[PDB]
């Protein structure tokens, strides 16, 4: 059981840097690249094999490729703390940026970087033995993560196809944005994020900012706390493969229990308890309130209002001190509650899974260490809501032919902007049909 992780773009590799720090701290791996022990209480030995492949003797090298067009953050990583940890070739760096340009990323510099990326991933997969699947980390607002992200996804689908591809994507928030042409970029990326990813999990930044303001009461959060929380979420959802527990689920369970139709795969994520060191020692942590907080929309990583929508199906990973008794009690309470409502074409809409190892804390982080935690991943129509909110501001700019000459200059035809608009409209129509 092994899963590989690719990161594309700036945000992608920063989330991955955070994830890999967390993974090393979980598995007891020094930044040198060697585990100085065999105690490994965990769930068992050979747990690391799912992320770190043991090489040579007493040496563990991660199953990942960071890749980027601008060399700056790649060589910051190269010069930082985990030099001796990543393989020198695993980090891949272009020479110039894609610069917030989907066309520049998809047709100008993809055509030189993606072949190298693919023939590196091929030997990674070949070294691998029981590959579960790929997990991609990218941001759709930028140029790299958008254009050559989609290029790499197309090429992965044509190479392998039947293997799972978990895309934890960063979407643009409704009002928060650090770009201008990101609506164009998001639409051109979703055109292929629809029919190439199998399970796509959105993360906005405004929702995480609100979370960090309210719960963790950090008044001045940077991207580091966002990345640490995203790494925690990823770790919680892969703990089931990593350690053993009362009721485990692999990667192949999300595609089975959360994707009722091959086109409706866009998942709200959530996490609880997001709690600071003072609020830990003052709130009592039981399973009931954390299952209630996982659904209260003040604790979701995507800014949307599920009271406007209806849940298709949800998945609940539990970590730590959990027996099935209280988790069944809490799920029955939730199902009987009426402030949230399920779609009638799905009477039983929950998939629970439990793992015994509690979540770990990175020193310097702002999350306390807790008895237990919950990672919620649902499916609803807040996503079609989000898509329309985004389509509106895309069409606003496209009515006046703004910024179009860049893309047309970089080899993207004007017609593309019409068929991606139509694709998004068809996706909206499908969502509205299915919700009834």
């Amino acid at each position: 059981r092994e899963v590989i992780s690719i990161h594309i773009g700036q945000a992608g590799i920063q989330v991955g840097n955070a994830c890999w720090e967390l993974y090393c701290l979980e598995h007891g791996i020094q930044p040198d690249g060697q585990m100085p022990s065999d105690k490994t209480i965990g769930g068992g030995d050979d747990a690391f094999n799912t992320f770190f492949s043991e090489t040579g003797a007493g040496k563990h090298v991660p199953r990942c490729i960071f890749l980027d067009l601008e060399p700056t953050v790649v060589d910051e990583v190269r010069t930082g703390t985990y030099r001796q940890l990543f393989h020198p070739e695993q980090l891949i760096s272009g020479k110039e940026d894609a610069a917030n340009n989907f066309a520049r990323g998809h047709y100008t510099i993809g055509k030189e970087i993606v072949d190298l990326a693919l023939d590196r991933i091929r030997k990674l997969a070949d070294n691998c033995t029981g590959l579960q699947g790929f997990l991609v980390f990218n941001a759709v607002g930028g140029g790299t993560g958008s254009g050559l992200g989609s290029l790499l996804l197309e090429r992965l689908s044509v190479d392998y196809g039947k293997k799972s591809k978990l895309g934890f994507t960063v979407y643009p928030s409704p009002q928060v944005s650090t770009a201008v042409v990101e609506p164009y970029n998001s639409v051109l990326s979703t055109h292929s994020l629809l029919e190439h990813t199998d399970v796509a999990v959105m993360l906005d930044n405004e929702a995480i900012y609100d979370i960090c303001r309210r719960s963790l009461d950090i008044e001045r959060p940077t991207y580091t706390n966002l990345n640490r929380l995203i790494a925690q979420v990823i770790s919680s959802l892969t703990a089931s493969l990593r350690f053993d527990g009362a009721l485990n689920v692999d990667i192949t369970e999300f595609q089975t229990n959360l994707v009722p139709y091959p086109r409706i795969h866009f998942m709200l994520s959530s996490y609880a308890p997001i709690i600071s060191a003072e609020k830990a020692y003052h709130e009592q942590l039981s399973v009931a309130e954390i299952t209630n907080a996982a659904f209260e929309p003040a604790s979701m990583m995507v800014k949307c209002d599920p009271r406007h929508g209806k849940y298709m199906a949800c998945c609940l990973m539990y970590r730590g001190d959990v027996v099935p008794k209280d988790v069944n009690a809490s799920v029955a309470t939730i199902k009987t509650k009426r402030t949230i409502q399920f779609v009638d074409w799905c009477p039983t809409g929950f998939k629970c899974g439990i793992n015994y190892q509690p979540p770990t804390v990175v020193p310097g982080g702002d999350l306390a260490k807790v008895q237990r935690a919950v990672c919620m991943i649902s499916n609803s129509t807040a996503i079609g809501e989000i898509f329309s909110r985004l389509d509106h501001k895309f069409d606003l700019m496209y009515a006046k032919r703004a910024f179009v000459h860049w893309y047309v200059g970089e080899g993207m035809e004007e017609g593309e902007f019409s068929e991606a608009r139509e694709d998004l409209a068809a996706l909206e129509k499908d969502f509205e049909e299915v919700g009834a």
């Binding site: 040198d32 100085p36 007493g58 040496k59």
Partner: peptide
Amino acid sequence: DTATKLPQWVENDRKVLRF
């Protein structure tokens, strides 16, 4: 500046005890 623990096969390449 911390030394790493090499594999036994590369840390004792050509060392041979001789009696």
